Amino acid sequence: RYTMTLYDFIKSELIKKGFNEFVNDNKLTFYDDEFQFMQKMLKFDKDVL
């Protein structure tokens, strides 16, 4: 049995707010640790809060 998760929730709601993780400014930022969402949730910054 499967429904919605909770990582997907705040990921989708944070990507609703203009963020991104791949092509953020113009450079390829997939590997850069201060941009993908899992680090923003483990650091748990002002934004996810």
């Binding site: 997907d8 929730f9 989708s12 990507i15 609703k16």
Partner: peptide, 27 residues
């Protein structure tokens, strides 16, 4: 047979359905 989910991908669509269940959101 042998039901596999051969794609496993990433999405970019967003959700807060202000609703009690799936059902009431369909309504």
């Amino acid at each position: 047979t042998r039901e596999r989910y051969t794609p496993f991908y990433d999405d970019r669509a967003d959700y807060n359905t202000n609703s009690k269940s799936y059902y009431d959101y369909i309504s």
